[PDB]
Design a protein around this motif. Structure first.
Motif, PDB file in Angstrom:
ATOM      1  N   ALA A  43       0.779  -1.240   0.000  1.00  0.00           N
ATOM      2  CA  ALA A  43       0.000   0.000   0.000  1.00  0.00           C
ATOM      3  C   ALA A  43       0.837   1.333   0.000  1.00  0.00           C
ATOM      4  N   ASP A  44       1.806   1.348   0.940  1.00  0.00           N
ATOM      5  CA  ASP A  44       2.638   2.469   1.301  1.00  0.00           C
ATOM      6  C   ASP A  44       3.504   2.971   0.213  1.00  0.00           C
ATOM      7  N   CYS A  45       4.014   1.960  -0.486  1.00  0.00           N
ATOM      8  CA  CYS A  45       5.026   2.085  -1.486  1.00  0.00           C
ATOM      9  C   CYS A  45       4.513   2.408  -2.793  1.00  0.00           C
ATOM     10  N   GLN A  46       3.466   1.707  -3.178  1.00  0.00           N
ATOM     11  CA  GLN A  46       2.699   2.073  -4.377  1.00  0.00           C
ATOM     12  C   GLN A  46       2.248   3.478  -4.446  1.00  0.00           C
ATOM     13  N   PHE A  47       1.469   4.025  -3.400  1.00  0.00           N
ATOM     14  CA  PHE A  47       0.841   5.325  -3.309  1.00  0.00           C
ATOM     15  C   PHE A  47       1.720   6.471  -3.469  1.00  0.00           C
ATOM     16  N   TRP A  48       2.729   6.608  -2.475  1.00  0.00           N
ATOM     17  CA  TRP A  48       3.596   7.735  -2.473  1.00  0.00           C
ATOM     18  C   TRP A  48       4.435   7.810  -3.738  1.00  0.00           C
ATOM     19  N   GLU A  49       4.544   6.783  -4.536  1.00  0.00           N
ATOM     20  CA  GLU A  49       5.367   6.892  -5.745  1.00  0.00           C
ATOM     21  C   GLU A  49       4.571   7.280  -6.906  1.00  0.00           C
ATOM     22  N   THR A  50       3.233   7.213  -6.892  1.00  0.00           N
ATOM     23  CA  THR A  50       2.285   7.916  -7.762  1.00  0.00           C
ATOM     24  C   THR A  50       2.380   9.392  -7.653  1.00  0.00           C
ATOM     25  N   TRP A  51       2.398   9.843  -6.426  1.00  0.00           N
ATOM     26  CA  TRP A  51       2.506  11.283  -6.094  1.00  0.00           C
ATOM     27  C   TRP A  51       3.864  11.833  -6.311  1.00  0.00           C
ATOM     28  N   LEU A  52       4.889  10.932  -6.364  1.00  0.00           N
ATOM     29  CA  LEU A  52       6.192  11.279  -6.688  1.00  0.00           C
ATOM     30  C   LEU A  52       6.240  11.519  -8.203  1.00  0.00           C
ATOM     31  N   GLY A  53       5.518  10.664  -8.961  1.00  0.00           N
ATOM     32  CA  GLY A  53       5.270  11.003 -10.317  1.00  0.00           C
ATOM     33  C   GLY A  53       4.473  12.336 -10.537  1.00  0.00           C
ATOM     34  N   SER A  54       3.621  12.703  -9.571  1.00  0.00           N
ATOM     35  CA  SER A  54       2.923  13.996  -9.658  1.00  0.00           C
ATOM     36  C   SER A  54       3.957  15.117  -9.523  1.00  0.00           C
ATOM     37  N   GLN A  55       4.944  15.034  -8.659  1.00  0.00           N
ATOM     38  CA  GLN A  55       5.887  16.085  -8.481  1.00  0.00           C
ATOM     39  C   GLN A  55       6.983  16.117  -9.504  1.00  0.00           C
ATOM     40  N   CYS A  56       7.070  14.978 -10.273  1.00  0.00           N
ATOM     41  CA  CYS A  56       8.061  14.716 -11.284  1.00  0.00           C
ATOM     42  C   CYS A  56       7.683  15.552 -12.449  1.00  0.00           C
ATOM     43  N   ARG A  57       6.364  15.589 -12.829  1.00  0.00           N
ATOM     44  CA  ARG A  57       5.764  16.362 -13.906  1.00  0.00           C
ATOM     45  C   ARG A  57       5.780  17.804 -13.502  1.00  0.00           C
TER      46      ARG A  57
END
Lengths: 195, 226, 229, 204, 222, 212, 196, 49, 196, 195
Positions: free
Chosen positions: F50-64
């Motif tokens: 759960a933990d790992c999946q989620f925050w790396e989506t949002w890391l993709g949000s900050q990546c863009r």
């Protein structure tokens, strides 16, 4: 727990035990062996709990040799293995726990095949072509499976086992200062001072 | 698990379920909870299954010893007081809740015995986890003196209340009717609900549809001349 | 931090053809000690819904006021629905549910079991349940506290399944509730003789018979009990 | 942790028409480490077959415990032991300790020689007969099995109908488990000749 | 002393097909060994050919039905009647789950519907947050009974062509809407006898491009 | 469970499993432990799903949102140390996190970072995180040469995961290979781990201990 | 569970109810807790249902053997027994017994044995867990010296206040009358005293 | 049981001989009056009488 | 601690016992528990000495302010200030408070408010640890609208059983009389009530 | 690991840090920096609790660089140690404890005199001729107080450290796999590759 590895070579069992001994937070000794020859053709190495190991190791040499001198013939490694199993089995039920993990390796000259056994602290006997206990076991079980062949000569078994030593040193947070090597073979029980 | 024990005028009638559970899974849809201390003194057991069956076997053997040693038919108390004593020894580390019922020359009896060493007497008792659901129907319908035919319909319909409302109770309904100075009748499967429906197809597979690795034969026959 | 201090047990209910019968025991317990007697717990909320609340006296009393304040809140303006369609059991129910939901968030929940039963303006029986777990489910027969594994079996005889409601009159339904109360009085240590029976009929309103006793008690066999030996 | 779940081990067993079948996996772990991909956990005392599950050591200890007692019966009464008598014996042995208990789940599978009838039994930890004449299974993917077997099973299975059913049932269950699998060995027990077949299936 | 997680049981089951999708569940509600109600939908339609079921702890499982359908509303409003897709819907559910993780939902959630190709689509959520597309996935307390049987019949896991003995692998057959009705029935027949928290009723909802149809079958009364 | 990545000449081979367990019961055997942080970053999933999946989506949000603002693609060292500052916060608010962010840019080269759940951030050429990271290491480090070719390297991603899969209780399911280039990752599909077994059994001569 | 005993001029009358809970669940509502251990030395049991039945068999045994070799034991004698089992198993047995009995010479006498186990002769004793509530009602309205008729109404009403306040006490009221004349059980159903 | 391997003929004959030995040695007991012929096969010496 | 209040023809009489312990040691045995928080609405404190005292001030703060804006509050009203504050500090603090007052309309009234916070109208109330002993005496012997002298000797006899059996209570018995006439103090010494 | 060592000599401060970083079951990196520059003549080497160490490094680095840019003035090693002691002392009182042991060695260019500071996890700085941290640090003290002289030059101090490194290898039961040597000289902060 420390280093204690077996590999079943075509004609021999090559066992190796840690030199380092740490009781407390200071290594106190660093040339100690953890192995005691049971019979001319069966060697037993042990690791587990401190001080449980030294006493219980002397206990098995005593009893198996008691029976050897009764019958002027020596038990098979299968038969010694079962005795060690029997005892530890009574010991997890009994009041004081023992906790000794053993690789018993022997050359049976009557089956004419080297035999290697792994007896854990709980009391489970298993025949294996390579083996290990504890912390070391986790990195090596997969490393030995890779390169092995069914039949390998004695000096090939040494070379492989020194790949396993070499690997261990990088990866383990513990320090073990190299192993002592012993070959148990059909031509007797000898050591190799090459590490 | 609903196991009722209901007295009526001419004897005692004891009924049970046959669904025996182990946690959320149904282990077995067919065992029996009814044991035999003695031929006319049946008992059933509830709670930890191992500790019922072994306690009933253990004490079963000893009242039969005794019954030869007096050369007399066993009495309900004889079984009952031996029970009581035994469970008390471990201080209720044994978990039995048995209804002990039976007839003998000196009348009808019905006791219940809990896991520590407590004992009560009534005219309608129930043990089990479903016990509560039994008990509700039992207290309204019952009345002093029943006939045999009435007593088996009260018994059965009390386990059925159990089936419907208590998850852990289901399957067939056994009965064993004990009546003073006539033999004890076992009516297994009296009324059977909870029939499983036919599969929508069968699942039969043809040969070789699971892989084989190698073949050997194991020889279980005794050692003989070759 | 919530622990029951003063407790109530048992409210039972079922449907019939023109309405429902909800009835409850009367007793303010303090464990073993029965410290309060005659404790009303069929709280009339409207007159086409009775809310029967059980559990902590303290927790019920404090949500009893919110129930009365709800009826006030609806009655504000609206001249064709200030008492004419302001209320259905269903509306009242949702509100109870999520207030308890939000108090379980805090983890000092209102410690109660709550039945809301009445009859709507469709002529539809209504009977749903909420609790300090906050599970929400409809049921055709229902019970709470110690009756929720005692009284539930009995009443399921009448109500085998969902097609047995239109057969079941208001004369059969009286009888079942009476029988259930007897049995609760015998086998529950929290129960008592005094219970209140309300019929919420859609054609005769909130009919509240008050201060019923249990009848036709059997205690004849009890002198025939002897020693253990 | 739990004592049974420290190597795993499953035993499944089902009855047919003039045949029973028993089947295990071969895995022995010490927690996460798989230690051996072969270790038979079925053993056979005469024409009874004994399946043993639960805790690692207690497969070994308890097996040779039955070695000793089977022997006393065979030496004395001058016949091999019948399915039913051996079921009783297992029940008696498991109960012998109830304070400091065993931790195993035996499965008795056999066909009586005195009447030509299938007989199976099951057990729990403390030990009680669990009757069926349909199926019994034991282990730690016993849960997964109980379903699998029910869907598939059909009363009165033929001898090599019974083989495909039990082989598939076991395969699917064990690879939905961590601590059992790595190969499986299926016995088909007839009235005269029992066939040993290892099964090719997912190691990983 | 308070502990706000029980179990209310039930079992759910998602099957993706080739132009259909099936999300079924039972309608038994229990708390421990007493039957609360025989009849109680858990598989709700939520608009736009998404069917949801949040099974496990009932209250929680009603909580995320609440908020999910609330999002159906606000999406259509501030996008002026835009149809919300399976892909889009999945990711919203995950945000609500995860944002409470210091008081988490204690349910096993599954959605099912079609995708944009006109094939089945089934995603499944773990308790805390994240999710992954599946093709068969049960959840609930009888999950581990229905699942190995359905991989043996959908994907034919570890089966082979017959008479070759592990040389040839059995090819994966197509899935009819009629055939997948049967599997659900057979499975839930096995569930009942061997597991004590499935019963009374089985409700299959079959979802297609044609509409949502409900179909009710009885199970055993116990 | 095992996620490993090793840099070589060609870029990075990432190789991961797809079995994610819950209890002794196996949940799903088809899970993707690759998380597209964007087309030019691949994030591993190890530790809590759960933990790992989620925050790396949002890391993709900050990546863009690094990418628009600089008009320049996010650097591998900038992403990693974002994600690192976030998880230090919830360091003893009880959450987990074991990712290797694996990337190749034109002005920094291939660079792995191993961001932990304590906010430790270690660079390095090889990492392995998982409940089968001990089984993985041994085989991976034996068969290592830094100068390697792509074909050979692809084969190494399989062979180390395989070994890991064989002995580890929770490893198996399917494997996936990706080969990160500078231009992006290109996906190399799904191999079942049990059908892979029989191939390399023949080819190498391995797994003597497995009977048959 | 409420147990009492009250002495009167021509004997002692013992009084118990019949409701015995474990939990909130009434196991049997017609339970008999007034037990024979001899033939004129009767007891009342309260406390842990297992531990009273256990102890009380063991006294039944000692006393009857006392009869067979030595002649009938006294109330005094029997009371000492029950103390000597509580005191030596005070570490794990929760049992408070009232031993009331008719000696020839001395009429009815009451001894009560705490949980810790000790003789106390009393003009009347109450113990249980619902008999804590009637300590004030017995004490004030207790007349030392009563008649047979007076005694039964006194104890009936004492048990009614105890029933009213304890949900572990209810059901029918059981009485045993021990007098030289003999042994008489009396029983009152609830309709007969909830009116008073 | 303890060695998992078939008993030699030597061991078994001596074990009995020691039982009989115990009765003459002590206790004031009479000796058991039996004379045994043992037939055995074992690995080491083959057939043994 | 032992407090009670019991209604009568013209009002109510409130009664208490003034022993106040910390552990084994009595801190002071003359300590009043009868508290004026309004001048016709008195109250009786029990449970922890701290906890009740703090509550009695904050309740005084809210009835003072009632009387200056809206006229004198009724007994019904003062109880409800106690209720809702006991609500907020149910787990935080403990209180037993019995609220008893004279109203000029409905005469005297007694409400009882446990620690959870609930109100219950009753004609008589007992609280403390003195009250699990005297329960039965109070209910057999009560009849509504009894004469003034009969109230005085009933509360007396009730509280003499509380001091006799509970040892946590003691000291002097004090009473406050709420009547139409006013507030009248009574006090009865130990040598008076032991006889009576 | 937990070994940071200091020997100050009469022209130089020698700070050494463990190479190995061991997290979880294995040693992950056996070669890794574990010290960062604060200033051009102020070096902090650090060890301790995982995941505080990375963060407490870059937070200090951000601040000291902010001062040294802002005001055009490199801080005194006297100043820097205090600043670091303020944060360490503050975090014991605060919610989030920082467990890190920090050795700050600098060359003061205002006194023209080497200075070494020892700051424990709690926050008490104390300037020393030499200092160490951890259970490992214990072993080094007794060779340091034997062989040290305070007239020493670069080379003499180097040869003393080498014994300390060798010692650690025999007596310590856990690896650290060599050290990076960094020297705060009078011409900057130079890394030297000698082991």
């Amino acid at each position: 727990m420390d280093i204690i590895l077996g590999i079943r070579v075509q004609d021999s069992v090559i066992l190796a035990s840690s030199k380092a001994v740490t009781r407390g937070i200071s290594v106190l000794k660093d040339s100690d062996d953890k192995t005691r020859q049971l019979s001319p053709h069966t060697l037993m190495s042990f690791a587990g709990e401190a001080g449980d190991t030294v006493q219980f190791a002397e206990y098995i040499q005593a009893n198996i040799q008691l029976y050897s001198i009764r019958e002027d013939y020596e038990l098979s490694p299968q038969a010694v293995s079962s005795f060690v199993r029997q005892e530890l089995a009574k010991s997890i039920r009994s009041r004081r726990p023992y906790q000794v993990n053993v690789l018993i390796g022997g050359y049976d000259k009557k089956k004419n095949k080297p035999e290697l056994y792994q007896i854990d602290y709980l009391g489970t006997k298993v025949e294996l072509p390579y083996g290990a206990h504890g912390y070391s076991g986790f990195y090596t079980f997969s490393l030995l499976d890779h390169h092995y062949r069914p039949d390998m000569t004695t000096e090939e078994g040494l070379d492989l086992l020194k790949l396993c030593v070499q690997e261990l040193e990088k990866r383990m947070p513990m320090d073990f200062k190299g192993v002592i090597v012993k070959i148990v073979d059909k031509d007797g029980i000898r050591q190799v001072d090459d590490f | 698990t609903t196991i009722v024990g209901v007295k009526f005028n001419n004897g005692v009638v004891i009924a049970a379920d046959t669904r025996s559970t182990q946690g959320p899974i149904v282990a077995d849809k067919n065992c029996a909870k009814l044991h035999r201390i003695s031929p006319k003194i049946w008992c059933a057991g509830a709670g930890t299954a191992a500790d019922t069956e072994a306690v009933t076997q253990l004490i079963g053997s000893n009242i039969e010893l005794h019954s030869l040693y007096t050369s007399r038919e066993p009495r309900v108390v004889s079984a009952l007081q031996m029970l009581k004593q035994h469970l008390f020894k471990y201080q209720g580390h044994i978990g039995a809740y048995l209804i002990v019922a039976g007839v003998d020359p000196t009348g009808s009896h019905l006791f219940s015995i809990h896991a520590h060493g407590s004992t009560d007497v009534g005219y309608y008792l129930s043990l089990g986890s479903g016990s509560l659901a039994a008990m509700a129907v039992l207290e309204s319908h019952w009345k002093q003196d029943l006939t045999k035919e009435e007593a088996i319909k009260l018994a059965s319909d009390a386990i059925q209340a159990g089936i419907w409302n208590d998850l852990g109770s289901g399957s067939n309904v056994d009965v064993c009717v004990m009546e003073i100075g006539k033999d004890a009748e076992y009516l297994r499967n009296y009324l059977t609900p909870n029939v499983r429906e036919e599969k929508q197809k069968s699942y039969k597979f043809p040969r070789g549809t699971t892989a084989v690795l190698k073949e050997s034969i194991v020889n279980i026959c005794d050692i003989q001349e070759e | 931090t919530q622990q029951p201090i003063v407790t109530g047990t048992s409210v039972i209910s079922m449907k019939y053809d023109n309405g429902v019968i909800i009835a409850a025991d009367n007793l303010g317990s303090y464990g073993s000690l029965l410290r309060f007697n005659g404790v009303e717990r069929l709280i009339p909320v409207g007159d086409n819904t009775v809310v029967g609340i059980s559990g902590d006296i303290s927790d019920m009393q404090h949500i009893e006021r919110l129930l009365k304040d709800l009826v006030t809140e609806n009655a504000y303006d609206n001249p064709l629905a200030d008492a004419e369609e302001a209320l259905e059991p269903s509306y009242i129910f949702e509100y109870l549910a999520t207030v308890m939901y939000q108090r379980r968030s805090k983890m000092n929940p209102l410690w109660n079991a709550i039945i809301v039963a009445g009859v709507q303006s469709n002529g539809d029986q209504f009977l749903r349940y909420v609790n300090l777990l906050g599970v929400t489910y409809s049921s055709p027969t229902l019970a709470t506290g110690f009756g929720a594994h005692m009284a539930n079996p009995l009443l399921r005889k009448v109500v085998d399944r969902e097609s047995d409601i239109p057969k079941t009159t208001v004369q059969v339904a009286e009888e079942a509730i009476v029988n259930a109360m007897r049995v609760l009085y015998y086998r529950d240590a929290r129960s008592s003789r005094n219970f209140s029976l309300a019929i919420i009929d859609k054609n005769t309103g909130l009919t509240f018979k008050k201060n019923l006793q249990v009848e036709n008690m059997k205690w004849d066999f009890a002198k025939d009990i002897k020693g253990y030996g | 942790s739990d004592p049974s779940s420290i190597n795993g081990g499953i035993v499944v067993a089902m009855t047919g028409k003039d045949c029973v079948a028993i089947a295990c996996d071969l895995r022995l772990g010490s927690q996460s480490l798989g230690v051996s991909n072969k270790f038979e956990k079925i053993f056979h005392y005469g024409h009874v077959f004994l399946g043993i599950t639960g805790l690692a050591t207690d497969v070994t200890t308890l097996n040779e415990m039955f070695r000793y007692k089977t022997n006393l019966y065979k030496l004395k009464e001058e016949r091999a032991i019948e399915p039913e008598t051996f079921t009783q014996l297992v029940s008696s042995s498991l109960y012998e300790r109830r304070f400091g208990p065993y931790f195993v789940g035996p499965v008795v599978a056999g066909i009586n020689s005195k009447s030509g009838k299938p007989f199976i039994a099951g057990f729990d930890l403390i030990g009680c007969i669990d009757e069926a004449k349909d199926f019994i299974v034991s282990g730690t993917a016993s849960d997964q099995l109980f379903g699998m077997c029910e869907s598939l099973y059909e009363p009165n299975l033929e001898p090599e109908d019974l083989f495909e059913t039990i082989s598939q049932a076991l395969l699917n269950a064990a690879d939905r488990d961590a601590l059992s699998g790595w190969g499986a060995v299926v016995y088909i027990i007839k009235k005269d000749e029992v066939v040993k077949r290892y099964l090719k299936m997912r190691q990983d | 002393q308070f502990n706000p997680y029980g179990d209310n049981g039930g079992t759910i089951l998602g099957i993706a097909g080739e132009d259909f999708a099936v999300l079924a569940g039972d309608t038994r509600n229990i708390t421990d060994y007493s039957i609360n109600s025989r009849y109680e939908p858990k598989v709700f339609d939520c608009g736009d050919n998404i069917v949801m079921s949040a099974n496990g702890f009932a209250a929680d499982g009603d909580a995320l039905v609440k908020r999910f359908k609330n999002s159906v509303k606000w999406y259509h409003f501030d996008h002026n009647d835009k149809k919300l897709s399976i892909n889009s819907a999945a990711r919203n559910i995950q945000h609500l789950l995860y944002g409470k993780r210091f008081f988490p939902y204690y349910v096993h959630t599954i959605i099912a519907g079609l995708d944009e190709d006109g094939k089945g689509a089934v995603y499944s959520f773990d308790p805390v947050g994240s999710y992954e597309r599946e093709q068969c996935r049960a959840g609930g307390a009888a999950a581990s009974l229905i699942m190995p049987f359905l991989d043996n019949q959908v994907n034919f896991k570890n089966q082979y062509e017959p008479g070759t003995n592990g040389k040839v692998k059995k090819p994966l057959k197509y899935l009819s809407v009629e055939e997948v009705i049967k599997l659900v029935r057979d499975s839930f027949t096995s569930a009942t006898e061997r597991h004590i928290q499935v019963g009374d009723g089985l409700e299959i909802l079959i979802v297609t491009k044609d509409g949502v149809r409900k179909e009710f079958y009885e199970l055993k009364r116990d | 469970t095992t996620t490993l990545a090793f840099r070589f000449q060609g870029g990075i081979i990432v190789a991961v499993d797809s079995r994610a367990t819950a209890g002794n019961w196996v949940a799903s055997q088809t899970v993707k432990k690759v998380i597209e942080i964007n087309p030019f970053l691949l994030g591993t999933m190890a530790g809590g799903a759960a933990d790992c999946q989620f925050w790396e989506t949002w890391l993709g949000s900050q990546c863009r949102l690094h990418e628009l603002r600089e008009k320049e693609r996010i650097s591998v060292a900038a992403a990693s140390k974002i994600l690192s500052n976030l998880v230090y916060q919830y360091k003893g608010a009880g959450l987990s996190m074991g990712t290797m962010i694996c990337g190749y840019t034109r002005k920094e080269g291939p660079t792995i970072y191993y961001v932990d759940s304590d906010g430790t951030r270690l660079k390095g050429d090889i990492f392995c995180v998982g409940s089968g990271q001990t089984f993985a290491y041994g085989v991976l480090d034996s068969n290592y040469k830094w100068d390697l070719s792509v074909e050979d390297a692809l084969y190494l991603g399989k062979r180390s995961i395989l070994a890991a899969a064989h002995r580890d209780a929770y490893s198996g399911g399917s494997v996936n290979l990706y080969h990160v280039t500078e231009d992006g990752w290109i996906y190399h599909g799904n191999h079942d781990v049990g059908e892979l077994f029989w191939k390399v059994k023949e080819e190498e001569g391995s797994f003597n201990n497995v009977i048959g | 569970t409420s147990i009492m005993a009250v002495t009167f001029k021509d004997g002692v009358i013992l009084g118990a109810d019949s409701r015995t809970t474990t939990g909130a669940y009434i196991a049997n509502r017609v339970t008999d807790k007034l037990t024979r251990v001899h033939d004129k030395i009767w007891c009342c049991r309260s406390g842990s249902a297992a531990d009273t039945q256990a102890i009380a068999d063991i006294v039944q045994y000692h006393l009857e053997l006392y009869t067979s070799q030595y002649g009938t034991p006294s109330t005094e004698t029997a009371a000492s027994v029950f103390k000597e089992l509580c005191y030596e198993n005070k570490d794990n047995l929760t049992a408070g017994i009232i031993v009331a009995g008719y000696d020839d010479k001395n009429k009815g006498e009451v001894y009560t044995i705490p949980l810790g186990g000790s003789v106390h002769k009393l003009p009347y004793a109450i113990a249980g867990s619902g008999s804590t509530f009637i300590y004030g009602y017995c004490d004030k309205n207790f007349r030392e010296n009563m008649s047979k008729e007076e005694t039964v109404d006194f104890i009936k009403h004492s048990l009614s206040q105890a029933i009213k306040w304890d949900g572990s006490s209810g059901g029918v009221i059981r009485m045993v009358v021990l007098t030289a004349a003999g042994v008489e059980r009396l029983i009152f159903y609830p309709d007969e005293y909830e009116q008073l | 049981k303890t060695y998992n391997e078939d008993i030699p003929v030597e061991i078994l004959v001596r074990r009995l001989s020691d039982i009989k030995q115990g009765y003459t040695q002590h206790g004031g007991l009479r000796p058991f009056g039996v004379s045994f012929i043992y037939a055995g096969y074992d690995d080491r010496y083959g057939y043994q009488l």
